[PDB]
Amino acid sequence: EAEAKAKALEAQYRERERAETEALLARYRERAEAEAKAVREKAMARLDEAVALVLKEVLP
Amino acid sequence: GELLVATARTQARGEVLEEVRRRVREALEALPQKPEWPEVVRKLALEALEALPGAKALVANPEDLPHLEALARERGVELQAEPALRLGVRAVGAEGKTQVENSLLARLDRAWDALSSKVAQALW
Amino acid sequence: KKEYTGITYISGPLLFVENAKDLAYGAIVDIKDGTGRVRGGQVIEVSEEYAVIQVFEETTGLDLATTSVSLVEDVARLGVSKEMLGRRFNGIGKPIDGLPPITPEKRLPITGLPLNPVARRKPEQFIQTGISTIDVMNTLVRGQKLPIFSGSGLPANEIAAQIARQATVRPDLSGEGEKEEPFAVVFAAMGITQRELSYFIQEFERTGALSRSVLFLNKADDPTIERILTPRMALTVAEYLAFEHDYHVLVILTDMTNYCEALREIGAAREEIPGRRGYPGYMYTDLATIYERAGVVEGKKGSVTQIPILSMPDDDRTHPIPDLTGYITEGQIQLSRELHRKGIYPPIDPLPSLSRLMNNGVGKGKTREDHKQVSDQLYSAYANGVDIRKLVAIIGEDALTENDRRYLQFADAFERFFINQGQQNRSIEESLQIAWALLSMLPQGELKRISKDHIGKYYGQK
Amino acid sequence: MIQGVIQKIAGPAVIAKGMLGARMYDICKVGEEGLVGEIIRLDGDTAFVQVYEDTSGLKVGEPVVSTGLPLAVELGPGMLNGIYDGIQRPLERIREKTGIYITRGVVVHALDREKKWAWTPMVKPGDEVRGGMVLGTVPEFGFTHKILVPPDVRGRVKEVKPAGEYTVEEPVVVLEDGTELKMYHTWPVRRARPVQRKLDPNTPFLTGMRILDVLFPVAMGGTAAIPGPFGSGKTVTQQSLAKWSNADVVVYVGCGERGNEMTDVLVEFPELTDPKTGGPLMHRTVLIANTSNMPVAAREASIYVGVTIAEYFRDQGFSVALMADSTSRWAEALREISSRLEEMPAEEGYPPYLAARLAAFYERAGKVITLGGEEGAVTIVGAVSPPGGDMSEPVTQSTLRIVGAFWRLDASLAFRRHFPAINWNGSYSLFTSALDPWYRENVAEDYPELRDAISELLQREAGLQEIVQLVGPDALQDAERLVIEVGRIIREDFLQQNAYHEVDAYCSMKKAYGIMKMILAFYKEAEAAIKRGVSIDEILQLPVLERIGRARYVSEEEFPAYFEEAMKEIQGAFKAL
Ligand SMILES: Nc1ncnc2c1ncn2[C@@H]1O[C@H](COP(=O)(O)OP(=O)(O)O)[C@@H](O)[C@H]1O
Numbered sequence A: 001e002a003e004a005k006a007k008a009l010e011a012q013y014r015e016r017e018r019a020e021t022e023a024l025l026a027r028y029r030e031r032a033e034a035e036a037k038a039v040r041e042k043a044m045a046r047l048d049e050a051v052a053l054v055l056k057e058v059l060p
Numbered sequence B: 001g002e003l004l005v006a007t008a009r010t011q012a013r014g015e016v017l018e019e020v021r022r023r024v025r026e027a028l029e030a031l032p033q034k035p036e037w038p039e040v041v042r043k044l045a046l047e048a049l050e051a052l053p054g055a056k057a058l059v060a061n062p063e064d065l066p067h068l069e070a071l072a073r074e075r076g077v078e079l080q081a082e083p084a085l086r087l088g089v090r091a092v093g094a095e096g097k098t099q100v101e102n103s104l105l106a107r108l109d110r111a112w113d114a115l116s117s118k119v120a121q122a123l124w
Numbered sequence C: 001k002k003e004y005t006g007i008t009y010i011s012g013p014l015l016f017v018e019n020a021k022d023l024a025y026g027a028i029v030d031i032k033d034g035t036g037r038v039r040g041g042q043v044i045e046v047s048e049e050y051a052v053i054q055v056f057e058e059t060t061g062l063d064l065a066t067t068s069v070s071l072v073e074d075v076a077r078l079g080v081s082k083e084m085l086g087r088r089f090n091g092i093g094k095p096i097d098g099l100p101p102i103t104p105e106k107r108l109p110i111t112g113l114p115l116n117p118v119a120r121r122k123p124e125q126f127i128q129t130g131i132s133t134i135d136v137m138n139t140l141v142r143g144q145k146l147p148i149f150s151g152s153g154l155p156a157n158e159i160a161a162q163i164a165r166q167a168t169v170r171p172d173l174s175g176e177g178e179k180e181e182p183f184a185v186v187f188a189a190m191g192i193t194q195r196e197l198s199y200f201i202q203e204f205e206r207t208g209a210l211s212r213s214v215l216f217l218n219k220a221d222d223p224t225i226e227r228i229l230t231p232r233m234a235l236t237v238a239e240y241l242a243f244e245h246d247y248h249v250l251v252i253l254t255d256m257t258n259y260c261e262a263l264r265e266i267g268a269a270r271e272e273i274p275g276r277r278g279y280p281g282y283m284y285t286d287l288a289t290i291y292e293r294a295g296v297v298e299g300k301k302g303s304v305t306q307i308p309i310l311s312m313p314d315d316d317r318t319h320p321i322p323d324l325t326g327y328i329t330e331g332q333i334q335l336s337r338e339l340h341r342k343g344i345y346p347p348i349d350p351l352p353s354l355s356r357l358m359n360n361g362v363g364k365g366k367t368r369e370d371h372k373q374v375s376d377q378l379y380s381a382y383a384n385g386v387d388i389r390k391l392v393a394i395i396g397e398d399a400l401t402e403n404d405r406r407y408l409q410f411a412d413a414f415e416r417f418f419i420n421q422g423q424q425n426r427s428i429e430e431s432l433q434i435a436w437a438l439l440s441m442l443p444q445g446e447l448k449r450i451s452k453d454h455i456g457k458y459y460g461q462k
Numbered sequence D: 001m002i003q004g005v006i007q008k009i010a011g012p013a014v015i016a017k018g019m020l021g022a023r024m025y026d027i028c029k030v031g032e033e034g035l036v037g038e039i040i041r042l043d044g045d046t047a048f049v050q051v052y053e054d055t056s057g058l059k060v061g062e063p064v065v066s067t068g069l070p071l072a073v074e075l076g077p078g079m080l081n082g083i084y085d086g087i088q089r090p091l092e093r094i095r096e097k098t099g100i101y102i103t104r105g106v107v108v109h110a111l112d113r114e115k116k117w118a119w120t121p122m123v124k125p126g127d128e129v130r131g132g133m134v135l136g137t138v139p140e141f142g143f144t145h146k147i148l149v150p151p152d153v154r155g156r157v158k159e160v161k162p163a164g165e166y167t168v169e170e171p172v173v174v175l176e177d178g179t180e181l182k183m184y185h186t187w188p189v190r191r192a193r194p195v196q197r198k199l200d201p202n203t204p205f206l207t208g209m210r211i212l213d214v215l216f217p218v219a220m221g222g223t224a225a226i227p228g229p230f231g232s233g234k235t236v237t238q239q240s241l242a243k244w245s246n247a248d249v250v251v252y253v254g255c256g257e258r259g260n261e262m263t264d265v266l267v268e269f270p271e272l273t274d275p276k277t278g279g280p281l282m283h284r285t286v287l288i289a290n291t292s293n294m295p296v297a298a299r300e301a302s303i304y305v306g307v308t309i310a311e312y313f314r315d316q317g318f319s320v321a322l323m324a325d326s327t328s329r330w331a332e333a334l335r336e337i338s339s340r341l342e343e344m345p346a347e348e349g350y351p352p353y354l355a356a357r358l359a360a361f362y363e364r365a366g367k368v369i370t371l372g373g374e375e376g377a378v379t380i381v382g383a384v385s386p387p388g389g390d391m392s393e394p395v396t397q398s399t400l401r402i403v404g405a406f407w408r409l410d411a412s413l414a415f416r417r418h419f420p421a422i423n424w425n426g427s428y429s430l431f432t433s434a435l436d437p438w439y440r441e442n443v444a445e446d447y448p449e450l451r452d453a454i455s456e457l458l459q460r461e462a463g464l465q466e467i468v469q470l471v472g473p474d475a476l477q478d479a480e481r482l483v484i485e486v487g488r489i490i491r492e493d494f495l496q497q498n499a500y501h502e503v504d505a506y507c508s509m510k511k512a513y514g515i516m517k518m519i520l521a522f523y524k525e526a527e528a529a530i531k532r533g534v535s536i537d538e539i540l541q542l543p544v545l546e547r548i549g550r551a552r553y554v555s556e557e558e559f560p561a562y563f564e565e566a567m568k569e570i571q572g573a574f575k576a577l
């Protein structure tokens, strides 16, 4: 009885941690994708004047 | 998960800097047919002289052989025309065994790490 | 942007460059072959007539007609930033992890400076390293540089990876200062098999303990001068982080024997006389240069702990490499063939292995107040367990006293419950707990190194 | 191309002047006889050509013509069932041309030309082949020998000649350019064939020796260094590895080792049978031979040619072993032509860059996934001959830091004929950890347990040898004289193997599992029966362990039923004491 209840709680908590890992997993995929968008959006609004800065350093 | 988040952040950081470097490269490679480049070439030409005193020869793009003729005879040096050296000049000094090179592409490849730290500061 | 063409005399790893005098001594050069390939060289012996360049890589395609050199970074430096803590580097400083390169805050010279001997304090706290027979019997204090004298075929790289992903400070064991220090592992492997390089990439990125570390790796087939420059790189990155951003930092220098072989085979390139037993005479100074750049600092809130792991050459302690290492460092810990292949991991053995600074790193509010006495007691008990286990072959089990058979059972079970750790993240309280469970098999009263306060408090419980 | 004249001759070193502008490592043609040579150390006008044949009768003024190419092998179909020398010249062709001596100055091709191979095409026209995509197949003695795109060649295939009988010159696949792709292609010996991605060692190299497969294993992408004094069974061991192991092809690189132990290899491999399929064993060995009186600069070329032919057969999805005996003869060739550069040498006399060379050679091993997508693996077994018979040299203690699987021989085990003379006390293998999955899913489930028990019994024996030679094998306790006698019977049964017996030459690992299970069943129940209290004379005269002492001579067919009955008698002869 004791070893049966042991492996029953073992399998149930396997599957519980599997759901935990998959939930935080998909959360952090969406998190990294949203942050990649959140930075490459910020890329565009300061492009040409920074290029003028580097062009003024390179051609001094 | 936090380490993958940091990987995505540094990846985005690097590709925005790749965008910046690429558009600087395109502005550089679009310079020599816009109405400034015979004012561009003289500065780096005389500075290729002054970075190696005692030159004998210069060689650069033959599209502005006039601006390398009548503004470098006072520089007192051979001028020989060989293309394939885009945006600049190179100076062969004395005894034929030294060659200072000078190009805006070369200056970008020498200055881009320092300007990358500076652009990342003034950009983020 | 300034080629010095006109070179003469290539010879093995040395090419000479004519008519060059702006080449700073110890500069780095791009050697460009005439077919568009770039190599590295270090400038040595720059004179009026010429300047010698020791080429980094092989010399195959070079010639005299079309071969140019040019200067980059005239004294050796690296670009350091705070955001290099998820990265690998190739000895020079270029990544091999595929991520786009860092935005360098500072630009530091990879040759360091000696600390000012008034400007440091003594090391006084401790660190846990997961290994029980390090945490209890020869403690790693923050500032110590203790080397792991491996063998040849013993696991040293596995203990490297284990200490790398299991070291943690314990400020809760202190009088509860802040957690404002994070921890940082600077891991510098020089001269590795590349099988071990696959082992280090997977054993760092596996558990997600790469995110507080930085791996300066280079293979064996990579050129020898990167195996020179690698511990300079790692100690100057760690010195930057620990004295500019207040991190307790642990620096793991893998395989110092590969370093000293590369130092011999780069000393013999530029034609200086090898001194004792083939090694250069300045090996003591050059090796102390990369040991004595660790340690705490007065006033600042950092500490640089340093573990040089080194193979013994022909497993003796009279060779120049472990002789000078034990003649510079702070004690040693030592693996053993005997434990390893009667089957034990990690195979540290606590008889010949000591730490100098343990008496300053344990005690009142450091880790636990009974620590040093249990250290001495475990040492003497395993000491007279080994030789009584060796004597019992020629007298017999049933022809001793009784406490001596208790010592024999203690030693035989000691070296498979205390040293046979396996891989569990063994804390300091758990390891002292199992140390008292092992001391319980000795009779009370026979523990003649501990006063009865800690005896009555802790002893008895298996 | 580039003309020069000889300024100086000394031995195999010819300083040739006037060669303003040749590169390093370009093969020269020295003298009017067309001697092969190699450029090092050029300073202005001169260049320093070492030569691959003995200069005698060469005189100054004679011309030197460079080529511009570095030392290039010609790779293709036609190297299996082959003997070459250090610059890939076929010795059957040299015997057909000359008599029984090797006259210098000969030009022969690295692959024969008139032999009509049998092209089967693979790719349809119009495809965009990358460097390393396959092109077609050729049956080459039971191996479906592929024909690669050479590395660093990209394009679109226009034409493909059909499934016919062709020759190795004839261009079968022309790209869109006119860049055509014939069967053979040259490749420089100093660049590893650039591979896609290098996998990890997780699969054994089944040797056939028992100790070299049970106590000290070699994985698939592994390296293995076998050093030993003279007269210690190196070359019989390496012929056993070439003869019985599970590799697809075997590259035997004779480098400084004597003539007769490649003569007999040419004489007795054509009668043998491959253990993998039914082909004759000489149809899977490439055999590069540089004997000692063949000239003393070619040794470097012979080892680099053997390892790059092995890398070519790695790219074709095969699985290669490379047995390079006497790497220290290549160290001596580097010392000898580093004695005419008059440079300052390192420790012992050797040049400084010797560890750089040994690293750059032992790091072409490793199981890889190649350019074609299919995976392959070169394993390398390198022998080391120390000068004094002392593993404290700059050869051995530069090569023991970059290898796993170090098999240190000794002379004392080979003075009496206890072969192979593996000194167990100082050998190791770093592939015991990361191979136990394969051992579990292919030999037996309890194989690590049994193996580690064998290891700790041998360690406990070699810990008690101290006491037993300081006091004597009498006046002991009887519970450890069983340890010493089980160590004695494991050294007389499990480790000791004669290669020339018809059986026990080869020993697959279920037989070794059977013998170890017999020995440890005996030791477990014997220490049980001695804690019951018996003699130890009464153990060492049982009729149950002459069975054990003969239990390596049964074949791999009788060994199951023989194993069941020996196991039965060991389980049944201890209750009767
Ligand atoms: N596996 C073996 N079984 C029995 N005898 C062996 C074995 N290996 C070597 N020997 C004996 O030792 C000799 C060693 O030959 P060889 O390997 O050429 O010497 P070296 O070890 O110096 O190369 C052989 O001729 C043979 O008589």
Ligand SMILES: [Mg+2]
Pocket (backbone or CB within 6 Å): D234, D235, D257, D325
């Ligand atoms: Mg031999």
